Design a protein around this ligand. Structure first.
Ligand SMILES: O=C(O)[C@@H](O)[C@@H](O)[C@H](O)[C@H](O)CO
Ligand SMILES: O=C(O)[C@@H](O)[C@@H](O)[C@H](O)[C@H](O)CO
Ligand SMILES: [Cl-]
Ligand SMILES: [Mg+2]
Ligand SMILES: [Mg+2]
Lengths: 389, 384
């Protein structure tokens, strides 16, 4: 499987996606997601200028050696641009390997551990009542799990060419959030899995406060409570609440969460394939997690392409310690650019049976949607302080 | 303070690749920051060109702290080599501007001088021990009081080197033996392990070299897992340095707080700039850790000039690495720092004292070049 060609495709069927494609001598090809929301062209350049030329002539069957070659060989290790490029290669190589094996990817990984992949939907509204209306609608679609967000008194996040500036007040939020969860439980009961994303805005003692306040609502998870570059940040939360915790969509390395996991400070690891060094790296993450009862909860936003979603569904299908799969539906244009054989049914994903990860890119269609810059917002406190979005 | 009127990158290859960021205010005052990331240069260039520069326009140039947080937190995806280098580039350019506006060389704005000169070390690399010894001699004559000694081990795209840990461990002590026997004990002797050992091997090496009293043993082992340094520290009193591959205080917070290293090596260009490195040096000071800035040729004279200003002020200065740039590189980046008798003297001109000759720079187009990779004798892709 000597690599004849490799290149990136950049497209915007409703939002930006970057994709690496690798083509071997026998015409066997694989694609990997390389999308990094708000910083897309950095990964495209990292790939186009520095990785791509090095892939020509390599044996595409050597997945592990290529991963170490790119990770160690970069000299500068880890990081979002770095690991997303590496994940793109890794994802494409596993795609090729599965095709060469004549197997859908989940079979290659060790076979299926489950007959379907539970997901959760996004239920958002300006008021509690709107959110509740959303919960109803998604329950009717078959979803067993919902992420609930509402407005605090007093959707594509990367919504502006340059970062939009939002205002934040922690105390208003804390005083309001438990009210949402109580109303969700009042209307829908305890059968429903209910998730909330705190989205980095709290200090640990504040997140401890919240966690304790929402214990009577039995959240499936409380996600991204606090910025966690300092992993010890989760300690105070964990020591003060039994509300399950989730973190890691902003992580790109097992070194970002090793201590979180070993200390049992989280219940679910959120780092996905595209940002976490791909299949090769994520297997090691899931394995470590399994030693401590920690389960996978893959980030699955619009800003990871169907290539990642397809591969993630295969991964979800095999991995023993599967928790849940996030599902923010891509636009119809996006789905058309990325033909795939995974399917959604009654609140769950079903892995494809086609060899590879089951996803392709229609390059002719993708060319109809040129890149359009879009940045993630910033968050400021009411005094102007640049805060966490 | 004034608004940023323009910002752009310059990419030049006067002997090797450099990427540079320039920021220009309403008044026409300008500043520059190094953004060079060896072997991945265009990732940072694109990071800057497409995502950061457009957001700089109209910003108040005097708001260094706010711009740093804005880019660090606002990126959402935090930390990393490309990320933090891009942030360093902005930070350095903004400090350059603020020092100009204050009419002071950078070291004054940071708190003034703590020392009269900045000690450096020279690279003395030889194919053999003898070769190495000759380099030490010739740098001693240039006035260097400290030398980094390396010898070969007997028996566009990335070069691929072969490596033998056991051969290196049996050989290295002989190098230091010979250096000490010829040059005596006054000289500071440094050695760079360059990532190739496991911790118990590095502990072995550390013990073996105790009799030769090295200034430091550097980058013993890959340290994404900061606990990797613990076994070394518990088995040897040979001083340890690490950090040129780091880009964040979170890459080294535990190494420092646990007193596992003596010198932190992360430089301005890759460690998020002046703003970030002040925080790292402050943490280091609490635990007797001193700065030992990475100073290869792949960090531009822009970085070196700013590092020298930093070195001049920082209380817990250790040493400054010096790999002299080529003549053409020096011409492309005019500067007022000077090397004398083994030490640097900071510039006295306002800003960090480095400029870029854009006309000259445009004469040297980018030329792709990659860092080598290492493989064991069995083919295993190892740490370079
Ligand atoms: O959990 C989530 O889905 C959110 O945190 C993401 O939609 C996130 O805001 C975007 O992926 C940012 O790129
Ligand atoms: O200490 C040193 O001088 C070396 O480790 C560096 O030259 C390093 O190998 C390169 O600068 C990385 O680009
Ligand atoms: Cl990065
Ligand atoms: Mg989230
Ligand atoms: Mg070094």
């Amino acid at each position: 499987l000597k690599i004849r060609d490799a290149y990136t495709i950049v497209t915007c069927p409703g939002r930006n996606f970057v994709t690496l494609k690798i083509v071997t001598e026998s015409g066997t090809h694989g694609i990997g997601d390389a999308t990094l929301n708000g910083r897309e062209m950095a990964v495209a350049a990292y790939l186009d200028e520095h990785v791509v030329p090095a892939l020509i002539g390599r044996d595409a069957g050597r997945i592990e050696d290529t991963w170490q070659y790119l990770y160690r060989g970069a000299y500068w290790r880890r990081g979002p641009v770095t690991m997303t490029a590496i994940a793109a290669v890794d994802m494409a190589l596993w795609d090729i390997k599965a095709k060469a094996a004549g197997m859908p990817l989940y079979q290659l990984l060790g076979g299926k551990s489950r007959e379907r992949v539970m997901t959760y939907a996004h239920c958002t509204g300006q008021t509690i009542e709107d959110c509740l209306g959303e919960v109803a609608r998604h329950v009717e679609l078959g979803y067993r799990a919902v992420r609930v967000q509402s407005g605090v008194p007093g959707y594509e996040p990367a919504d502006s060419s340059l970062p939009a500036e939002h205002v934040w007040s922690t105390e208003k939020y804390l005083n309001h959030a438990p009210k949402l969860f109580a109303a969700v439980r009042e209307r829908f009961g305890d059968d429903l899995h209910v998730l909330h994303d705190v989205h980095h805005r709290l200090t640990p003692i504040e997140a401890a406060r919240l966690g304790k306040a929402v214990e009577p609502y039995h959240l499936f998870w409380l996600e991204d409570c606090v910025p966690a570059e300092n992993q010890e940040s989760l300690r105070l939360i964990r020591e003060h609440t039994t509300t399950p915790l989730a973190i890691g969509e902003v992580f790109n390395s097992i070194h970002d969460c090793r201590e979180l996991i070993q200390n049992q400070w989280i219940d679910y690891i959120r780092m996905p394939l595209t940002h976490g060094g791909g299949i090769t790296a994520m297997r090691r993450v899931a394995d470590l997690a399994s030693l401590y009862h920690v389960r996978t909860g893959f980030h699955g936003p619009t800003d990871l392409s169907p290539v990642c979603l397809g591969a993630a569904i295969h991964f979800d299908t095999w991995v023993p310690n599967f928790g849940i799969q996030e599902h923010m539906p891509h636009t119809d244009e996006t789905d058309a650019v990325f033909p795939h054989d995974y399917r959604f049914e009654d609140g769950h994903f079903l892995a494809g049976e086609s060899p590879g990860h089951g996803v392709d890119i229609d390059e002719e269609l993708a060319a109809k949607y040129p890149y359009e810059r879009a940045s993630l917002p910033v968050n400021r406190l009411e005094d102007g302080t640049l805060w966490h979005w």
